[PDB]
Design a protein around this ligand. Structure first.
Ligand code: HEM
Length: 137
């Protein structure tokens, strides 16, 4: 289930992080409007740009901690507060986070592997709710 999935992702986190984030950016190309440096780049290119590698590993390191601190796929309100308050996320709305989690669940659904994709779908919805409650637009 969900807690085992966190252990599976953590065991190859840099590969999973890059591959899910690319799934996100390829499913929702207008989302590169938050990442202008990523325009006109193939996946293999993006993987070779330092700020892509280093945002994406830091995104997934923190997302796995937030997932690990959750109860029944419901994140801590403190985790949502921390995420909202991040100066680098001033541009963003809950829509940006919803799209990341849609791509993450679709990635799990298409993988060869017994991920609990329904728990990730609830985690993504619950995080978006928590972000709204913490002050995200
Ligand atoms: C659980 C979800 C997310 C986490 C945990 C997260 C985490 C982070 C972290 C830790 C940083 C600091 C990394 C660094 O610059 O050294 C950062 C920066 C940033 N995040 Fe996020 N982020 C998340 C979702 C998003 C989403 C969905 C977007 C846009 C759709 C986004 C856009 C950005 C941008 C634009 C920056 C700074 C510029 C850059 O990425 O190069 N983040 N994020």
């Amino acid at each position: 289930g969900f807690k085992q999935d966190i252990a599976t992702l953590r065991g190859d986190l840099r590969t999973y992080a890059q591959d899910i984030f690319l799934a996100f950016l390829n499913k929702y190309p207008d989302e590169k409007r938050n990442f202008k440096n990523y325009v006109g780049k193939s996946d293999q290119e993006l993987k070779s740009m330092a700020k892509f590698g280093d945002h994406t590993e830091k995104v997934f390191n923190l997302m796995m901690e937030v997932a690990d601190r959750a109860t029944d796929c419901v994140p801590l309100a403190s985790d949502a507060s921390t995420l909202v308050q991040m100066k680098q996320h001033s541009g963003l709305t809950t829509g940006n986070f919803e799209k990341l989690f849609v791509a993450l669940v679709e990635y799990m659904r298409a993988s060869g592997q017994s991920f609990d994709s329904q728990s990730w779908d609830r985690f993504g919805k619950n995080l978006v709710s928590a972000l709204s409650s913490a002050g995200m637009k």
